[PDB]
Enzyme design. Structure first.
Site, PDB file in Angstrom:
ATOM      1  N   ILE A  13       0.817  -1.233   0.000  1.00 22.98           N
ATOM      2  CA  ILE A  13       0.000   0.000   0.000  1.00 22.98           C
ATOM      3  C   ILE A  13       0.847   1.279   0.000  1.00 22.98           C
ATOM      4  O   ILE A  13       0.355   2.400  -0.066  1.00 22.98           O
ATOM      5  CB  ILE A  13      -1.044  -0.041   1.153  1.00 22.98           C
ATOM      6  CG1 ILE A  13      -0.332  -0.104   2.544  1.00 22.98           C
ATOM      7  CG2 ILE A  13      -2.040  -1.250   0.903  1.00 22.98           C
ATOM      8  CD1 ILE A  13      -1.290   0.051   3.775  1.00 22.98           C
ATOM      9  N   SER A  15       5.105   2.776  -0.802  1.00 23.64           N
ATOM     10  CA  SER A  15       6.504   2.597  -1.175  1.00 23.64           C
ATOM     11  C   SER A  15       7.287   3.820  -0.737  1.00 23.64           C
ATOM     12  O   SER A  15       8.509   3.746  -0.723  1.00 23.64           O
ATOM     13  CB  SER A  15       6.632   2.447  -2.692  1.00 23.64           C
ATOM     14  OG  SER A  15       5.905   1.333  -3.179  1.00 23.64           O
ATOM     15  N   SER A  16       8.841   0.112   2.334  1.00 17.76           N
ATOM     16  CA  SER A  16       7.497  -0.451   2.047  1.00 17.76           C
ATOM     17  C   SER A  16       6.482  -0.664   3.183  1.00 17.76           C
ATOM     18  O   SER A  16       6.809  -1.121   4.255  1.00 17.76           O
ATOM     19  CB  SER A  16       7.640  -1.775   1.297  1.00 17.76           C
ATOM     20  OG  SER A  16       7.982  -1.428   0.022  1.00 17.76           O
ATOM     21  N   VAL A  17       5.219  -0.418   2.858  1.00 20.13           N
ATOM     22  CA  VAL A  17       4.120  -0.676   3.772  1.00 20.13           C
ATOM     23  C   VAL A  17       3.179  -1.708   3.145  1.00 20.13           C
ATOM     24  O   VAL A  17       2.857  -1.618   1.991  1.00 20.13           O
ATOM     25  CB  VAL A  17       3.373   0.606   4.157  1.00 20.13           C
ATOM     26  CG1 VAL A  17       2.269   0.306   5.220  1.00 20.13           C
ATOM     27  CG2 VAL A  17       4.372   1.636   4.779  1.00 20.13           C
ATOM     28  N   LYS A  32       4.845  -1.535   8.223  1.00 19.82           N
ATOM     29  CA  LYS A  32       5.994  -0.909   7.545  1.00 19.82           C
ATOM     30  C   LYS A  32       7.271  -1.764   7.773  1.00 19.82           C
ATOM     31  O   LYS A  32       7.603  -2.133   8.907  1.00 19.82           O
ATOM     32  CB  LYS A  32       6.173   0.603   7.894  1.00 19.82           C
ATOM     33  CG  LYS A  32       7.380   1.306   7.179  1.00 19.82           C
ATOM     34  CD  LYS A  32       7.580   2.870   7.404  1.00 19.82           C
ATOM     35  CE  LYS A  32       7.905   3.315   8.974  1.00 19.82           C
ATOM     36  NZ  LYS A  32       9.336   3.114   9.625  1.00 19.82           N
ATOM     37  N   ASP A 127       6.015  16.622  11.180  1.00 19.45           N
ATOM     38  CA  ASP A 127       5.791  16.281   9.788  1.00 19.45           C
ATOM     39  C   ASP A 127       4.285  16.173   9.488  1.00 19.45           C
ATOM     40  O   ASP A 127       3.802  15.285   8.794  1.00 19.45           O
ATOM     41  CB  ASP A 127       6.558  15.033   9.365  1.00 19.45           C
ATOM     42  CG  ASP A 127       6.847  15.009   7.867  1.00 19.45           C
ATOM     43  OD1 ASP A 127       7.106  13.877   7.339  1.00 19.45           O
ATOM     44  OD2 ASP A 127       6.772  16.104   7.238  1.00 19.45           O
TER      45      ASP A 127
HETATM   46  C1  LIG Z   1      -5.980   4.992  -3.090  1.00 17.84           C
HETATM   47  N1  LIG Z   1      -6.310   4.897  -1.612  1.00 17.84           N
HETATM   48  C2  LIG Z   1      -7.749   5.253  -1.486  1.00 17.84           C
HETATM   49  C3  LIG Z   1      -5.969   3.594  -0.892  1.00 17.84           C
HETATM   50  C4  LIG Z   1      -4.553   2.998  -1.289  1.00 17.84           C
HETATM   51  C5  LIG Z   1      -3.454   3.072  -0.172  1.00 17.84           C
HETATM   52  O1  LIG Z   1      -4.136   2.925   1.143  1.00 17.84           O
HETATM   53  C6  LIG Z   1      -3.395   3.058   2.304  1.00 17.84           C
HETATM   54  C7  LIG Z   1      -2.006   3.398   2.301  1.00 17.84           C
HETATM   55  C8  LIG Z   1      -1.318   3.480   3.531  1.00 17.84           C
HETATM   56  C9  LIG Z   1      -2.015   3.235   4.750  1.00 17.84           C
HETATM   57  C10 LIG Z   1      -3.402   2.962   4.742  1.00 17.84           C
HETATM   58  C11 LIG Z   1      -4.099   2.811   3.506  1.00 17.84           C
HETATM   59  O2  LIG Z   1      -5.330   2.561   3.459  1.00 17.84           O
HETATM   60  C12 LIG Z   1      -1.078   3.364   5.765  1.00 17.84           C
HETATM   61  C13 LIG Z   1      -1.137   3.275   7.193  1.00 17.84           C
HETATM   62  C14 LIG Z   1       0.042   3.529   7.932  1.00 17.84           C
HETATM   63  C15 LIG Z   1       1.268   3.850   7.270  1.00 17.84           C
HETATM   64  C16 LIG Z   1       2.483   4.047   7.981  1.00 17.84           C
HETATM   65  C17 LIG Z   1       3.177   5.295   7.886  1.00 17.84           C
HETATM   66  C18 LIG Z   1       4.391   5.430   8.599  1.00 17.84           C
HETATM   67  C19 LIG Z   1       4.906   4.417   9.444  1.00 17.84           C
HETATM   68  C20 LIG Z   1       4.254   3.163   9.537  1.00 17.84           C
HETATM   69  C21 LIG Z   1       3.065   2.962   8.758  1.00 17.84           C
HETATM   70 CL1  LIG Z   1       2.410   1.371   8.960  1.00 17.84          CL
HETATM   71  C22 LIG Z   1       1.308   3.978   5.883  1.00 17.84           C
HETATM   72  C23 LIG Z   1       0.138   3.685   5.144  1.00 17.84           C
HETATM   73  N2  LIG Z   1      -0.045   3.762   3.840  1.00 17.84           N
HETATM   74  C24 LIG Z   1       1.095   4.094   2.886  1.00 17.84           C
HETATM   75  C25 LIG Z   1      -0.366   3.380   9.330  1.00 17.84           C
HETATM   76  O3  LIG Z   1       0.357   3.526  10.313  1.00 17.84           O
HETATM   77  N3  LIG Z   1      -1.629   3.039   9.442  1.00 17.84           N
HETATM   78  C26 LIG Z   1      -2.118   2.997   8.168  1.00 17.84           C
HETATM   79  O4  LIG Z   1      -3.272   2.650   7.937  1.00 17.84           O
END
Ligand SMILES: CN(C)CCCOc1cc2c(cc1O)c1c3c(c(-c4ccccc4Cl)cc1n2C)C(=O)NC3=O
Ligand SMILES: [Cl-]
EC number: 2.7.10.2
Length: 250
Positions: A13, A15, A16-17, A32, A127
């Protein structure tokens, strides 16, 4: 490996998560996986430390676990199925249909409550921007605690320059909570339908004089006046997160 064994990877979801189902509990998590880093390791560990004290709040992404294996570090967080504010804004941008004033206030209030919680833990986010706000009533939750620092830190890693208050650029760290306030106003401005914010140059400086970027819709004076004080050149003039959450406009 713990990751492979404990979780079923559903998709990448970010770019990795990855969006993963934990096999034992049946829930979906955002995990992540980053390469394990030193000053870089200290910065990685602050994210983890920050998450682990910031797990009680409905407007901050919940943390479950973190671990190290191979040359990777892993953090397993609450999955927000609505994506980030950045994607919702960018879709709005194509359809020429933005957050209306009632929804901007809701955005501001929810995220403001998140900041208020962060800031009461003597922490600052550093941030704040639409790509670090996640959508789950729609719920907004602050995530990406990668720049989190204690409020009186003599050293700060500055966040995205589009959202960066000038005083932080000038390495003046005397009022770091008000940096989050500045970035939150600009976040709300983007949600209101503004053009991509500038990264440098004369438009960048102009905002840092306290001039709101153009918003393609009509907002109450009282609401516009709140957003504008939130970007005041003098950080002291900006509301605290607590003053923001109690603000009569909200
Ligand atoms: C096109 N759109 C409508 C959906 C496609 C991508 O959807 C997501 C991307 C996401 C997360 C949730 C999503 O639903 C998402 C989350 C998270 C993170 C994230 C950011 C920094 C450090 C650790 C994480 Cl896991 C990064 C994340 N990304 C890049 C998070 O903590 N909780 C989340 O739901
Ligand atoms: Cl963004």
């Amino acid at each position: 490996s713990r990751y492979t064994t404990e979780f079923h990877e559903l998709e990448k979801i970010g770019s990795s998560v990855f969006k993963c189902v934990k096999r034992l509990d049946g829930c979906i998590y955002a995990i992540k996986r980053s390469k394990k880093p030193s000053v870089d390791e200290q910065n990685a560990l602050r994210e983890v430390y920050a998450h682990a004290v910031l797990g009680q709040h409905s407007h901050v992404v919940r943390y479950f676990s973190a671990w190290a294996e191979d040359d990777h570090m892993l953090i397993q967080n609450e999955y927000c199925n609505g994506g980030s504010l950045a994607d919702a804004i960018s879709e709005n941008y194509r359809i020429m249909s933005y957050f209306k004033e009632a929804e901007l206030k809701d955005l501001l209030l929810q995220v403001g409550r998140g900041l208020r919680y962060i800031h009461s833990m003597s922490l600052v986010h550093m941030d704040i921007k639409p790509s670090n706000i996640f959508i789950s009533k729609v719920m907004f939750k602050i995530g990406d605690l990668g720049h989190v620092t204690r409020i009186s830190s003599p050293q700060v890693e500055e966040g995205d320059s589009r959202f960066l208050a000038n005083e932080v650029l000038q390495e003046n760290y005397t009022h770091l909570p008000k940096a989050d306030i500045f970035a939150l106003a600009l976040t709300v401005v983007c949600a209101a339908g503004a053009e991509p914010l500038p990264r440098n140059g004369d438009q960048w400086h102009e905002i840092r004089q306290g001039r709101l970027p153009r918003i393609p819709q009509v907002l109450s004076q009282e609401f516009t006046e709140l957003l504008k004080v939130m970007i005041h050149p003098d950080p002291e003039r900006r509301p605290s997160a607590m003053a923001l959450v109690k603000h009569s406009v909200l």
